[PDB]
Design a protein around this ligand. Structure first.
Ligand SMILES: Nc1ncnc2c1ncn2[C@@H]1O[C@H](COP(=O)(O)OP(=O)(O)NP(=O)(O)O)[C@@H](O)[C@H]1O
Lengths: 139, 320
């Protein structure tokens, strides 16, 4: 009954995904834009010779948004899909657990997009559901 | 078209990375590379790279056995790592071979069961190979994710993913105490198309030469607006033309004085794309851009220009 999770920020707003799928976190450099494209995706980058789509988490959620601050992309891979989430910076992996995990999943505004909201040392760490949010983007 | 390149290009970083991964483990390895000139598509060199290094690593990490344990099994002290490449039909073949502790299919099956993935009677209709394919199946190596989380890399499921993304494929061949040998086969001829690389504000786009009727170099005046449409005339014939930035609503200075107008044909109709500058002709490999973009009609894929910058590929018929 022990969680491990990758946690990051968005203009001081903490969140986290499950390291289960997190592939890696590259430092955002250049992001070639894809014209006339669903505005919640900032474009595509070249990762080790393959083309990866960099979606903007801050915008996909609808939160504190500012660009010259977001310097980290969280590449993740599902069964068939691969995406890069752009966020301000990643604090890193964290060891969370049942006791620490709280659940007022009816509390946060973004429905299923985010599982329960957990806290540690008095923090607003929202536990987002990757495999789900990504599926929200693909389909 | 001479898109190929000798595999040396990827193989030379290795003889050294091998020599070092040995020290960081005290294993004595006689690394051999053979076929260090087998030409494979210009592309592969950047992707095929990490997977091979990974394989290369395993051998030295798990495969090759430490001196002692090695003399104990009556195997010369010095292990053997072999990186080879060759052509075998319509494919390029790259294999990483060693004579280490093997892969012991017997327990890989067990593990395969305890993870409720295979029935016990069913697991008999397997060939040593497929047994090993489990080695790929996601998280079939527990670990923890960490080393991978963001550190020194971990996982084959990817190595497979990669070679599979290259329309290729791979297999493992192993027997306990007789080393292992992974075999990657990539295609020898790709879906290469010829296109004119065209620019629009340091954004690069590509137009299949296979549709280009003729290219012209016009001025920001030759484009005359009728009622709505914008057209140009060439030795009579009026040819409708689209300003690429506007077609893609792209923040644009305004427009220089001089430009270029690519005139392409689709079925029975012809028109023209207006751009800032020509970049040149080239052979690119059309790579699709995820599902996060399926919807976008204007582009029929993307490509990785040599210098490593991406260039979206224009879909003649997809534009208005
Ligand atoms: N050449 C080999 N020799 C011996 N064992 C191998 C070889 N290749 C693969 N294996 C075994 O297959 C299992 C995993 O392969 P894979 O998922 O690619 O790597 P890993 O072992 O999980 N990660 P790392 O521990 O960083 O190398 C390993 O844990 C080994 O026990």
């Amino acid at each position: 009954k022990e969680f491990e999770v990758l946690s990051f920020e968005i203009d001081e707003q903490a969140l986290a995904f499950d390291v289960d799928n997190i592939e890696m976190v590259i430092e955002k450099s250049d992001i070639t834009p894809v014209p006339k494209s669903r505005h919640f995706v900032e474009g595509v980058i070249n990762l080790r010779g393959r083309i990866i789509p960099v979606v903007n988490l801050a915008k996909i959620l609808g939160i504190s948004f500012d660009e010259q601050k977001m310097k980290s992309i969280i590449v993740a891979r599902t069964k068939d899909v691969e995406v890069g989430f752009l966020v301000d910076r990643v604090l890193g992996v964290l060891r969370i657990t049942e006791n620490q995990l709280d659940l007022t999943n009816v509390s946060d505004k973004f429905g299923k997009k985010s599982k329960g909201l957990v806290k540690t040392d008095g923090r607003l760490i929202i536990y987002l559901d990757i495999d789900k949010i990504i599926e929200e983007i693909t389909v | 078209g001479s898109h190929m390149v000798p595999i040396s290009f990827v193989f030379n970083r290795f003889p050294r990375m091998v020599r070092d991964l040995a020290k960081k483990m005290n294993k004595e390895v006689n690394f051999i590379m053979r076929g260090e000139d087998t030409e494979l598509d210009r592309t592969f060199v950047e992707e095929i790279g990490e997977p091979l290094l990974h394989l290369l690593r395993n051998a030295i990490d798990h495969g090759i056995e430490p001196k002692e344990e090695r003399i104990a099994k009556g195997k010369p002290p010095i292990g053997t790592l072999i990186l080879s490449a060759r052509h075998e039909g319509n494919n390029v073949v790259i294999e990483v071979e060693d004579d280490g502790r093997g892969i012991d299919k017997e327990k890989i099956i067990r593990k395969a069961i305890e993870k409720g993935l295979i029935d016990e009677s069913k697991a008999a209709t397997l060939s040593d190979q497929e047994i090993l394919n489990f080695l790929f199946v996601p998280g079939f190596s527990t670990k923890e994710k960490v080393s991978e989380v963001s550190g020194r890399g971990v996982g084959m499921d990817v190595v497979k993913n990669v070679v599979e993304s290259l329309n290729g494929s791979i297999s493992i061949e192993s027997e306990k105490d007789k080393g292992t040998k992974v075999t990657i086969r990539l295609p020898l001829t790709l879906a290469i198309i010829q296109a004119l690389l065209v620019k629009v504000n340091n954004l690069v786009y590509a137009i299949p030469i296979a549709n280009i009727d003729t290219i012209l170099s016009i001025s920001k005046e030759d484009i005359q607006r009728v009622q709505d449409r914008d057209v140009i005339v060439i030795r009579g014939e009026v040819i409708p033309v689209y300003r690429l930035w506007e077609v893609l609503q792209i923040e644009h200075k305004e427009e220089l004085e001089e430009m270029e107008a690519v005139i392409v044909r689709v079925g029975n109709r012809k028109y023209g794309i207006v751009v800032d500058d020509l970049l040149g002709q080239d052979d690119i490999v059309i790579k699709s851009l995820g599902k996060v973009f399926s919807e976008v009609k204007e582009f029929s894929g993307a490509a990785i220009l040599g210098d490593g910058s991406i260039a979206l590929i224009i879909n003649v018929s997809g534009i208005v």
